Amino acid sequence: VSASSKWLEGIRKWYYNAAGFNKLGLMRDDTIHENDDVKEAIRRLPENLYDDRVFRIKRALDLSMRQQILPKEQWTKYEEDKFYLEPYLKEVIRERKEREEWAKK
Amino acid sequence: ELVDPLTTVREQCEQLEKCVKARERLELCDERVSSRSQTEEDCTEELFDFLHARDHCVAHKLFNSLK
Amino acid sequence: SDLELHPPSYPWSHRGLLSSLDHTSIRRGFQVYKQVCSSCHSMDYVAYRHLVGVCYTEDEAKALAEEVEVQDGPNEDGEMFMRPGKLSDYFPKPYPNPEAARAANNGALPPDLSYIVRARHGGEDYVFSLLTGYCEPPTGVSLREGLYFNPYFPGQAIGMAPPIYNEVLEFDDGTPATMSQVAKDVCTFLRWAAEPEHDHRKRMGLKMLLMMGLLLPLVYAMKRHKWSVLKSRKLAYRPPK
Amino acid sequence: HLVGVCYTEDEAKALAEEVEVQDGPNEDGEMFMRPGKLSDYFPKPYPN
Amino acid sequence: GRQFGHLTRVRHVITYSLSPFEQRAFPHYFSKGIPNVLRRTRACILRVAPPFVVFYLVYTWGTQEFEKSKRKNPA
Amino acid sequence: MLTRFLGPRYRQLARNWVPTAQLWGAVGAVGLVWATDWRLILDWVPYINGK
Amino acid sequence: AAPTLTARLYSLLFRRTSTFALTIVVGALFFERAFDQGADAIYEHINEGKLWKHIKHKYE
Amino acid sequence: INIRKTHPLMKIVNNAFIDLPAPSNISSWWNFGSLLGICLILQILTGLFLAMHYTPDTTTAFSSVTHICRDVNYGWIIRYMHANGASMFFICLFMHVGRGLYYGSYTFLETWNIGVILLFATMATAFMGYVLPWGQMSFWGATVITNLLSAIPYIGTNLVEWIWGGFSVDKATLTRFFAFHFISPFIIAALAMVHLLFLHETGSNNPTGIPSDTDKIPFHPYYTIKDILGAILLILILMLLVLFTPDLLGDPDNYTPANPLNTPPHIKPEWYFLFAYAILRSIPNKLGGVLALILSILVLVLMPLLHTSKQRSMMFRPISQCMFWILVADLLTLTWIGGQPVEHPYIIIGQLASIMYILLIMVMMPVASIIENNLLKW
Amino acid sequence: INIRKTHPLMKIVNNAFIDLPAPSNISSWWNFGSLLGICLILQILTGLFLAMHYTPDTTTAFSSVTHICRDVNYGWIIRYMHANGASMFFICLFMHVGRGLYYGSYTF
Amino acid sequence: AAKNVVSQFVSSMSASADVLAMSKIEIKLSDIPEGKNMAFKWRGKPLFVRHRTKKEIDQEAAVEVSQLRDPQHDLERVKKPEWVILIGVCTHLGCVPIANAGDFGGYYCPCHGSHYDASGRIRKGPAPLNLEVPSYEFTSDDMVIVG
Ligand code: HEM
Ligand code: HEM
Ligand code: HEM
Ligand code: HEM
Ligand code: HEM
Ligand code: FES
């Protein structure tokens, strides 16, 4: 979430200071629109992770209703964000690429 | 000679400055085309304009006047 | 004449968000009917039984009708000869045939005024600005003379004298006479044909102003009253270890 | 209606035209007479 | 489908509640409204405006364009 | 993403459905005919000639 | 007081559900005619443009 | 047990409004919906009561209208009023469309296409329904859309006959559409409960955009009371424009009696029907105009098909939002465009506005989507 | 899976007409029901189409009636006809009442 | 069964014995002497029938197409040189043109000064588009069917 990505992923950082996500402290991965692949993707998610994304999500709802945001300090640390799913997810990308693959076969 | 901002203030009101300017451009064109022969233009634009001011102040007075 | 006078705003006595009028000009509007206006005019949807409560009294309205020839229905009689007319009798406008208009002036459909304000376009000034704006053609133009000179108008040329200026002289209660209370009584008895509750309904709007101001807060309160707890909630993420 | 029924295009035709329409007005309200059309109906008696 | 109880899985979390009559309807009401209010609004403004700008520029603009275009000239 | 159903497999699938496809298509067409009896086609219809 | 308004007028009023309601309509009267009246006053001070006419109409 | 749980019709009910679990994060995007139905109900309600007096007869048109207006006390109010209220329904209509849009709610197809049925349905259902007044505006304009009935190759002549009832618009139409109105509202209704159950199936989205199972409450109290609120807001709206300046939105050509020979200068659609007729006159060909027309909403269907981004909420997608309010600019833009009669600047103006509609949606919005994706990098 | 099983609107449908398990012993007492609805539908249907022409206006009463009858081809038929059909609906109506009665179906 | 049923229902919207009749009901005699502009009442509007003169035809043929307010070459309206059939309502604000009047050997609108040439064609006044031409076929020599 840093200057190129604070301009660009600073649509998610400076301009999600504007578009909100990361300054809202969101989870990058969490932003993926729910899809089936996304669905079972999460089904396979890691546990401690699952809790984490949970608290994140709920909180997001919380301030959302509150229509407030955390301290800009509390606003999320830029860059410095594990790509949570992306190993798991992207793995699934290969999966549905595989079901998709022999499927093509 | 009933009180007639129509007539009455049309003296008083239409003495207006801007009104007079439109009168300048006005009779100006009046003679302008007037000189011409075999021409289609009646130059209504001015008459319209002067009227527009005449009203502009007019109801801004006449009603307040009129009873 | 294709160049629209944006009719100036005559501070119409009703021109306020709520504001009122006088009538018997409309009687002289009826006498504009009887003379000026509805000689050539229809209000035709106009119905006398309406104005009953408006201006004249039970008798004054009564005779006001009876003062007119009904041209009654037939008694065995088809044909249908004349009567005095009732309150139930409407406001019996002019010459019947559409060609009676076409001839009346040359062509010149003399339309009904019933909605005319609310019908044609523009406001009281359409009477004041436009109609009272009967005026000489400036130049460069000649009608068939069928159109008189009314410069303020669609063609700037037709149709009308100021029977004020050349007085058919009536103020029954007495005054010098002007166009409004029969013009805006042709707007009123157009609105008194449309928005007489422009008074009555006006009244209700008042209470509305309060109801919301009361309820709207009370409502919003109630909403907060509900949602409040949810507002402040504390939910703990305390993952074990 | 009866057009197709009995008389012929002409026979119906005149059959109408044989009757006085009492036409609508031409400028004319009043409304003087015509021969009437097939479109003209079957013009029954005294009005009142 | 939904309703509850088949709903979803939540492990190791916690809550806190309060009865309604407890609170005050409008703590810091005017106060809190605030550049909090301007925080949402003002936050969005830049994102918002430009099109509307073009608008006023337009109805104004073309308003002039055709409006003047209705004027008559000499010769 | 036509590649999804684009493959000699689904290609073969089409190769199967093809004649049937002709069949149901004909069904629709003729339906338009008899239903409509639209003059445009109706003309060519002999002894289905109605006059 | 106001504590018996909030309270007793809960208790001796808003407590019993019915009582709360009977209270409600009980108002519906007073409010109704009242706002009717003062409202009429508003319109009254608004104009005096007609129906005061009778005296001027010389109220035969 | 709890009858709330127990009673079968109720079992629907609780399942419908009452017991309904719903996303807690829920946003004001809501209100309009119940409004519309309330509107709709009132619509019917008034129309009904309106119907109760009103006659829709050829000689009676302005005639009964007076009887329904000049006679009719509060037929004044109810009439002109809830007439305006129709337009209000349109207001929340286009609004609501926006709701899905910046929502991007397009995720749920049967809902989307549903409200598409709601779309063209609302459109003509009005139009016919609307025209019923048969007023000079709606009259020569009746010659207008009446001339819309003729479009097709080889058909329209016979069609705009069959539509028109024959050689022109007529009392034929009068009955025809008159009924057509009488019917269509019902259609809207059943359509409604339809799309509704469809909704209850999936549940539905959230302004947040996250899976809602995290947080839900029943509409009662929350969405319930909130709804009550927005309703009061409505009566403010309707009961306002009504209550204060009823005629404000009107076009005088209405009160103008239909004068068959008239054909006056204006010929415009309603603030409701507005943005169309511009779009109509925009192109120089028949089916261009129409296919465009149905291609605006239909276009929106494609937009669900055109859905691109890896994230639902444009909230996180600012450049998208630029395309959003920007697209709106193209929209009310299209309004004021129609807001002029045929004019030199306008020609080009709308001429480009269409491209926008095709770009700002079909291209520039989708192109935008792709772009934002590229930027996303996650 | 089976869309018949699967499709939600269908899920109603199969649950309604199609997948509907129903007493095998079932008796002719039935028929009238769908009839009525068919009737009803036709009722509406015709009425609708009827409405389509018909005007219900004061001067038009017999007038439009002629236009709806004397004019109306099959307005003859549709009109007078499905008019009778109404009565038929009544027929199965009273009938049907009987159905419950000798049925004694009053249980529900 | 369904075919007739459905096609009866659909027919009931298409036209009417009543509306039909009157729709195309129009014929003309050959009494219109070159010169006079008769006038018929067809479809609730004015149906003008003008028998014309070599002089007429000749001049009307020689108007310039390029400069007309509503460009439309005489020769494409009338199906027969000699005869011109029109609808009698002024395309401005709807009065009725006056037969052979006004500055152009056509008609005259006594409402705003609207001049029509012999064809229909607008040659003076606000009038927008030229008087409109009905559909009609000439039957035998003495017969003309408007509509
Ligand atoms: C106070 C009485 C009258 C009032 C308030 C009145 C007002 C009006 C108004 C508002 C219009 C329509 C303006 C428009 O189309 O925008 C009109 C049209 C007309 N009235 Fe009057 N008028 C009155 C008396 C007359 C009289 C005495 C005559 C007979 C000279 C007359 C003959 C006409 C005609 C011919 C028109 C049609 C104008 C045209 O379209 O060329 N009216 N009038
Ligand atoms: C089935 C319930 C409805 C009935 C019975 C109904 C009946 C009527 C009738 C008889 C009129 C003519 C009288 C008048 O104009 O005041 C009318 C006008 C209209 N109503 Fe409806 N309608 C209904 C539902 C709707 C709906 C769903 C809409 C769409 C929001 C709608 C919008 C209109 C419009 C646009 C007009 C004409 C404009 C005007 O008020 O002058 N109404 N309706
Ligand atoms: C007859 C007019 C309509 C009615 C009465 C109606 C009713 C509703 C209701 C009651 C909701 C509940 C939740 C909410 O409002 O957000 C809703 C949501 C929705 N409607 Fe409509 N609607 C109508 C027109 C539309 C239109 C025109 C569309 C789009 C073409 C649409 C697509 C949706 C969608 C996608 C949702 C889900 C919203 C979300 O969860 O964010 N409906 N509607
Ligand atoms: C609007 C007219 C009605 C319609 C459309 C209607 C529709 C139906 C339908 C579709 C059935 C399915 C099974 C069957 O027909 O036996 C049914 C059964 C039944 N109906 Fe009706 N019905 C109507 C009037 C009545 C009336 C008037 C009654 C008695 C007051 C009635 C009481 C019943 C009962 C008790 C059954 C159960 C029959 C059994 O299983 O033996 N319904 N109806
Ligand atoms: C909502 C759909 C319906 C509409 C639009 C409708 C409308 C009409 C209209 C306009 C008439 C007068 C024209 C005529 O008599 O031919 C009529 C007659 C009638 N219809 Fe309906 N109606 C409908 C449903 C029904 C229903 C449910 C029944 C009850 C079976 C019904 C039974 C009748 C009867 C008894 C008459 C009068 C007798 C007659 O045909 O002369 N119709 N209807
Ligand atoms: S009606 Fe023909 S010039 Fe006005």
Short mmCIF file of all heavy atoms in Angstrom, two decimals, chain G, unseen atoms left out:
data_model
loop_
_atom_site.label_atom_id
_atom_site.label_comp_id
_atom_site.label_asym_id
_atom_site.label_seq_id
_atom_site.Cartn_x
_atom_site.Cartn_y
_atom_site.Cartn_z
N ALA G 1 -43.30 13.19 40.25
CA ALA G 1 -44.11 14.22 39.61
C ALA G 1 -43.99 14.10 38.10
O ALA G 1 -44.64 13.27 37.49
CB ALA G 1 -43.69 15.58 40.07
N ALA G 2 -43.16 14.92 37.48
CA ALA G 2 -42.59 14.50 36.21
C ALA G 2 -42.00 13.12 36.37
O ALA G 2 -42.01 12.34 35.41
CB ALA G 2 -41.55 15.50 35.71
N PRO G 3 -41.44 12.77 37.52
CA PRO G 3 -41.18 11.37 37.81
C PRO G 3 -42.43 10.55 37.96
O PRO G 3 -42.37 9.34 37.77
CB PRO G 3 -40.39 11.43 39.12
N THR G 4 -43.52 11.14 38.40
CA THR G 4 -44.80 10.46 38.40
C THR G 4 -45.54 10.69 37.10
O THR G 4 -46.57 10.07 36.85
CB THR G 4 -45.65 10.95 39.58
N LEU G 5 -45.05 11.62 36.30
CA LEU G 5 -45.51 11.71 34.94
C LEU G 5 -44.92 10.56 34.16
O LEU G 5 -45.63 9.69 33.65
CB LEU G 5 -45.10 13.05 34.32
N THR G 6 -43.60 10.54 34.07
CA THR G 6 -42.88 9.45 33.45
C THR G 6 -43.27 8.14 34.13
O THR G 6 -43.54 7.13 33.48
CB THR G 6 -41.38 9.70 33.56
N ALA G 7 -43.35 8.18 35.45
CA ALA G 7 -43.55 6.96 36.20
C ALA G 7 -45.03 6.72 36.44
O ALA G 7 -45.62 5.83 35.82
CB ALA G 7 -42.81 7.02 37.53
N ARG G 8 -45.65 7.48 37.33
CA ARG G 8 -47.08 7.34 37.50
C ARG G 8 -47.82 7.46 36.18
O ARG G 8 -48.70 6.66 35.91
CB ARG G 8 -47.62 8.37 38.48
N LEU G 9 -47.46 8.40 35.34
CA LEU G 9 -48.07 8.37 34.03
C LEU G 9 -47.53 7.26 33.15
O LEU G 9 -48.08 7.02 32.08
CB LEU G 9 -47.92 9.71 33.33
N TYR G 10 -46.44 6.60 33.53
CA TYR G 10 -46.35 5.22 33.08
C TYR G 10 -47.30 4.42 33.96
O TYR G 10 -48.36 3.98 33.51
CB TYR G 10 -44.92 4.69 33.14
N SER G 11 -46.97 4.33 35.24
CA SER G 11 -47.71 3.52 36.19
C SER G 11 -49.20 3.76 36.09
O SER G 11 -49.93 2.95 35.53
CB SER G 11 -47.24 3.82 37.61
N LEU G 12 -49.64 4.92 36.57
CA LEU G 12 -51.06 5.21 36.51
C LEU G 12 -51.45 5.70 35.14
O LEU G 12 -52.61 6.06 34.93
CB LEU G 12 -51.42 6.24 37.57
N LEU G 13 -50.52 5.78 34.20
CA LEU G 13 -51.02 5.91 32.84
C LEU G 13 -50.36 4.95 31.86
O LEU G 13 -50.98 3.97 31.44
CB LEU G 13 -50.89 7.36 32.36
N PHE G 14 -49.09 5.17 31.50
CA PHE G 14 -48.56 4.42 30.37
C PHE G 14 -48.33 2.96 30.69
O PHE G 14 -48.13 2.16 29.77
CB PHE G 14 -47.26 5.05 29.86
N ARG G 15 -48.35 2.57 31.97
CA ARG G 15 -48.11 1.18 32.33
C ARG G 15 -49.12 0.25 31.67
O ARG G 15 -48.76 -0.51 30.77
CB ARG G 15 -48.16 0.99 33.84
N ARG G 16 -50.37 0.29 32.10
CA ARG G 16 -51.35 -0.61 31.51
C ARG G 16 -51.50 -0.29 30.04
O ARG G 16 -51.77 0.86 29.66
CB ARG G 16 -52.69 -0.48 32.23
N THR G 17 -51.30 -1.31 29.21
CA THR G 17 -51.31 -1.10 27.77
C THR G 17 -52.59 -0.39 27.34
O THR G 17 -52.55 0.69 26.74
CB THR G 17 -51.19 -2.44 27.05
N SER G 18 -53.73 -0.99 27.67
CA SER G 18 -55.00 -0.34 27.43
C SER G 18 -54.94 1.10 27.89
O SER G 18 -55.06 2.03 27.09
CB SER G 18 -56.12 -1.09 28.14
N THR G 19 -54.70 1.30 29.19
CA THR G 19 -54.63 2.64 29.73
C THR G 19 -53.79 3.55 28.86
O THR G 19 -54.18 4.69 28.59
CB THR G 19 -54.07 2.59 31.15
N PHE G 20 -52.65 3.06 28.40
CA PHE G 20 -51.87 3.85 27.46
C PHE G 20 -52.72 4.25 26.26
O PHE G 20 -52.71 5.41 25.83
CB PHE G 20 -50.63 3.07 27.02
N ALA G 21 -53.49 3.31 25.74
CA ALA G 21 -54.27 3.61 24.55
C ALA G 21 -55.41 4.57 24.86
O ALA G 21 -55.54 5.63 24.22
CB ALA G 21 -54.82 2.31 23.95
N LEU G 22 -56.25 4.21 25.82
CA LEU G 22 -57.35 5.07 26.22
C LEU G 22 -56.85 6.48 26.44
O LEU G 22 -57.48 7.45 26.03
CB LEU G 22 -58.00 4.52 27.49
N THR G 23 -55.68 6.59 27.07
CA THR G 23 -55.01 7.87 27.12
C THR G 23 -54.85 8.44 25.72
O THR G 23 -55.17 9.60 25.47
CB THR G 23 -53.64 7.71 27.79
N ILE G 24 -54.37 7.62 24.79
CA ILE G 24 -54.06 8.13 23.46
C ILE G 24 -55.29 8.78 22.85
O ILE G 24 -55.28 9.97 22.51
CB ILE G 24 -53.51 7.00 22.56
N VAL G 25 -56.38 8.03 22.71
CA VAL G 25 -57.56 8.61 22.08
C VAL G 25 -58.09 9.76 22.91
O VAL G 25 -58.51 10.80 22.37
CB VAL G 25 -58.63 7.52 21.88
N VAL G 26 -58.06 9.60 24.23
CA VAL G 26 -58.48 10.65 25.14
C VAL G 26 -57.84 11.96 24.73
O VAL G 26 -58.48 13.01 24.71
CB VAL G 26 -58.12 10.27 26.59
N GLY G 27 -56.57 11.90 24.35
CA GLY G 27 -55.96 13.04 23.71
C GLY G 27 -56.60 13.33 22.37
O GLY G 27 -56.94 14.48 22.07
N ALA G 28 -56.81 12.29 21.55
CA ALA G 28 -57.23 12.49 20.17
C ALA G 28 -58.35 13.51 20.10
O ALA G 28 -58.36 14.38 19.22
CB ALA G 28 -57.67 11.18 19.54
N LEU G 29 -59.26 13.44 21.05
CA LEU G 29 -60.24 14.50 21.17
C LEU G 29 -59.57 15.86 21.32
O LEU G 29 -59.56 16.68 20.38
CB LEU G 29 -61.14 14.24 22.38
N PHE G 30 -58.99 16.09 22.50
CA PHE G 30 -58.53 17.42 22.87
C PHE G 30 -57.63 18.00 21.80
O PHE G 30 -57.88 19.11 21.29
CB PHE G 30 -57.80 17.36 24.21
N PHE G 31 -56.60 17.26 21.43
CA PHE G 31 -55.75 17.67 20.33
C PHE G 31 -56.56 18.03 19.11
O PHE G 31 -56.38 19.09 18.51
CB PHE G 31 -54.75 16.56 20.01
N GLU G 32 -57.49 17.15 18.72
CA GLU G 32 -58.19 17.35 17.46
C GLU G 32 -58.89 18.70 17.43
O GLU G 32 -58.57 19.57 16.61
CB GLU G 32 -59.20 16.22 17.25
N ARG G 33 -59.82 18.91 18.36
CA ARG G 33 -60.57 20.16 18.32
C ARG G 33 -59.66 21.34 18.53
O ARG G 33 -59.84 22.40 17.91
CB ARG G 33 -61.67 20.15 19.37
N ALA G 34 -58.67 21.18 19.39
CA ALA G 34 -57.79 22.30 19.72
C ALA G 34 -57.03 22.77 18.49
O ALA G 34 -57.19 23.90 18.03
CB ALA G 34 -56.83 21.89 20.82
N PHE G 35 -56.22 21.87 17.93
CA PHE G 35 -55.44 22.22 16.75
C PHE G 35 -56.35 22.71 15.65
O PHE G 35 -55.99 23.62 14.89
CB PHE G 35 -54.63 21.02 16.29
N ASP G 36 -57.54 22.12 15.55
CA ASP G 36 -58.55 22.70 14.69
C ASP G 36 -58.69 24.18 14.97
O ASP G 36 -58.59 25.02 14.07
CB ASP G 36 -59.88 21.97 14.91
N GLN G 37 -58.81 24.53 16.25
CA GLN G 37 -59.14 25.89 16.61
C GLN G 37 -57.96 26.80 16.34
O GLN G 37 -58.03 27.66 15.45
CB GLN G 37 -59.55 25.96 18.08
N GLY G 38 -56.88 26.62 17.08
CA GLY G 38 -55.72 27.48 16.89
C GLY G 38 -55.29 27.56 15.45
O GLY G 38 -54.86 28.61 14.97
N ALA G 39 -55.41 26.44 14.73
CA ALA G 39 -55.14 26.45 13.30
C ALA G 39 -56.01 27.49 12.61
O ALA G 39 -55.51 28.40 11.92
CB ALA G 39 -55.39 25.06 12.72
N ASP G 40 -57.32 27.38 12.82
CA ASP G 40 -58.24 28.37 12.29
C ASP G 40 -57.76 29.77 12.63
O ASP G 40 -57.88 30.69 11.81
CB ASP G 40 -59.63 28.12 12.85
N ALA G 41 -57.21 29.95 13.83
CA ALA G 41 -56.69 31.25 14.20
C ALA G 41 -55.55 31.65 13.28
O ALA G 41 -55.46 32.80 12.84
CB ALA G 41 -56.23 31.24 15.66
N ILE G 42 -54.65 30.72 12.99
CA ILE G 42 -53.53 31.03 12.10
C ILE G 42 -54.06 31.57 10.79
O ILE G 42 -53.76 32.71 10.40
CB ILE G 42 -52.66 29.79 11.88
N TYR G 43 -54.91 30.79 10.13
CA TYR G 43 -55.48 31.27 8.88
C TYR G 43 -56.19 32.59 9.10
O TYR G 43 -56.20 33.45 8.21
CB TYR G 43 -56.45 30.25 8.32
N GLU G 44 -56.77 32.78 10.28
CA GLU G 44 -57.52 33.99 10.55
C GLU G 44 -56.62 35.20 10.49
O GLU G 44 -56.79 36.09 9.65
CB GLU G 44 -58.20 33.87 11.91
N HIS G 45 -55.61 35.23 11.35
CA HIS G 45 -54.66 36.32 11.30
C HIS G 45 -53.98 36.40 9.94
O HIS G 45 -53.43 37.45 9.61
CB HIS G 45 -53.63 36.16 12.41
N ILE G 46 -54.04 35.33 9.15
CA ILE G 46 -53.37 35.36 7.86
C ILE G 46 -53.94 36.44 6.96
O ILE G 46 -53.19 37.18 6.33
CB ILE G 46 -53.46 33.98 7.20
N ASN G 47 -55.27 36.57 6.88
CA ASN G 47 -55.82 37.38 5.80
C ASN G 47 -56.90 38.39 6.18
O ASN G 47 -56.69 39.60 6.06
CB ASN G 47 -56.38 36.46 4.71
N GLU G 48 -58.07 37.90 6.60
CA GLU G 48 -59.30 38.69 6.69
C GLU G 48 -59.74 39.18 5.31
O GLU G 48 -60.14 40.33 5.13
CB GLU G 48 -59.15 39.87 7.65
N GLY G 49 -59.67 38.29 4.33
CA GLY G 49 -59.99 38.65 2.96
C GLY G 49 -61.38 38.24 2.52
O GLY G 49 -61.84 38.67 1.46
N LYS G 50 -62.05 37.39 3.30
CA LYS G 50 -63.40 36.98 2.97
C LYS G 50 -64.07 36.43 4.22
O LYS G 50 -63.42 36.17 5.24
CB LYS G 50 -63.42 35.95 1.85
N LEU G 51 -65.40 36.33 4.16
CA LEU G 51 -66.24 35.69 5.18
C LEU G 51 -66.25 36.54 6.43
O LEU G 51 -67.18 36.46 7.25
CB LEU G 51 -65.75 34.28 5.50
N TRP G 52 -65.23 37.37 6.58
CA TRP G 52 -65.39 38.65 7.22
C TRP G 52 -66.14 39.60 6.30
O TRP G 52 -66.54 40.68 6.72
CB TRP G 52 -64.03 39.23 7.60
N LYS G 53 -66.35 39.18 5.05
CA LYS G 53 -67.00 40.02 4.07
C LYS G 53 -68.43 40.36 4.47
O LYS G 53 -68.92 41.43 4.12
CB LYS G 53 -66.98 39.32 2.71
N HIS G 54 -69.10 39.47 5.20
CA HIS G 54 -70.53 39.63 5.47
C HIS G 54 -70.84 41.02 6.03
O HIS G 54 -71.70 41.73 5.50
CB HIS G 54 -71.00 38.54 6.43
N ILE G 55 -70.16 41.40 7.11
CA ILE G 55 -70.33 42.75 7.63
C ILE G 55 -70.07 43.76 6.53
O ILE G 55 -70.84 44.70 6.34
CB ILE G 55 -69.38 42.98 8.82
N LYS G 56 -68.98 43.57 5.79
CA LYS G 56 -68.75 44.40 4.63
C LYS G 56 -69.81 44.15 3.56
O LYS G 56 -70.30 45.08 2.93
CB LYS G 56 -67.36 44.14 4.07
N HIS G 57 -70.19 42.89 3.39
CA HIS G 57 -71.30 42.54 2.50
C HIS G 57 -72.57 43.12 3.08
O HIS G 57 -73.65 42.98 2.51
CB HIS G 57 -71.42 41.03 2.33
N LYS G 58 -72.43 43.71 4.27
CA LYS G 58 -73.53 44.32 4.98
C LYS G 58 -74.57 43.30 5.37
O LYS G 58 -75.72 43.64 5.61
CB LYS G 58 -74.18 45.44 4.16
N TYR G 59 -74.16 42.04 5.37
CA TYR G 59 -74.74 40.99 6.20
C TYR G 59 -76.25 41.18 6.33
O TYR G 59 -76.78 41.44 7.41
CB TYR G 59 -74.05 40.96 7.56
N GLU G 60 -76.94 41.07 5.20
CA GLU G 60 -78.37 41.32 5.18
C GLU G 60 -79.12 40.31 6.04
O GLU G 60 -80.03 39.63 5.57
CB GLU G 60 -78.90 41.29 3.75
#
